Structure formats: structure tokens, C-alpha cells
RNA sequence: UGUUUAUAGCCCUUGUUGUAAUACGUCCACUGGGGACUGAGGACUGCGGCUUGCCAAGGAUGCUGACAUAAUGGU
């Protein structure tokens, strides 16, 4: 099959059960809101 | 000074509004937030929920950025 296999039987990680679910933003950050930038260049 | 709701009212008992409210106690296998520390394990098995796939259910993954530097780290 492949060429130059590693001399170590690879350790596959255990199947994680972390499912990505949609972020629930703050109830006060509706579109059209005026906001204040705290960090960054602005 | 003396009296008995009058041109203020109060105290006691009962009825009512009443299945009154609140406080306190207790409980919810009811629920909304904010912060902190930790991520041990390493294919598959298990117990469960959902609808075979999915799942927060036998231990962290995902999306990114900066720097790739003495920056982290050590002496």
C-alpha cells in the first residue's frame, strides 16, 4: 500500500462527542444596535 | 377640668370580601443568567434519550488570529 510506514502503530484518538451547536448571542445585540468597540485599533 | 364620634378618630368582638394576599417553612425529575478551575482517557463495544442515524449518553472539541519569535520555557 503506502511507502515507508512509521515504525509505531498509530494511536487514533477516541471518538469525541462534542457536537457544534449554534451560538446563542446576547439578547441585547439585535441588528441595527449601536455598539461601542472596546478593543482593537478602533 | 369634665365627657363617648359629632366638624378627628382609636380599641375589642363578629360577619363579609375569601378558596384574600404576603411573610416564613418546605419542595419542583420548573427555569434564566454571570464568573472560576479542570480536559485525565485515546478505534470499536457499555447504559440510555431521540428518530436507522442522531445525542449534552463509559473524561474537549470546534472556529480563528498573532507570532514563528528567546515569544513560551529553563538556568
Q: What resolution in angstroms does the PDB record give? A: 2.8
Nucleic acid strand B: bases within 7 A of protein CB? 33, 39, 41-45, 54-57, 59-62
Instruction: Count CB atoms within 10 A of the CB of residue A39.
Output: 5
Please check whether residue A35 is in contact with residue A29, taking contact to mean a CB–CB distance below 8 angstroms.
Answer: yes
Rounded, the Å distance between the CA of A10 and C1' of B53 is 29
Rounded, the Å distance between the CA of A3 and C1' of B64 is 34
The 8-class DSSP code of residue A14 comes to P
Quote the CA–CA distance of A21 and A5 in Å, as a whole number.
38
Query: Long-range pairs for A6-11 at CB < 8 Å and ≥24 separation?
Result: none
Experimental technique: cryo-EM
Distances (CA, A) of A10 to A6, A7, A14: 8, 9, 12
- Beta carbon of A34 within 7 Å of strand B? no
Quote the CA–CA distance of A38 and A42 in Å, as a whole number.
8
Amino acid at each position: 500500500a503506502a511507502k515507508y510506514y512509521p515504525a509505531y502503530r498509530e494511536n487514533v484518538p477516541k471518538k469525541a462527542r462534542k457536537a457544534v451547536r449554534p451560538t446563542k448571542l446576547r439578547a441585547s445585540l439585535a441588528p441595527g444596535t449601536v455598539c461601542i468597540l472596546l478593543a482593537g485599533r478602533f
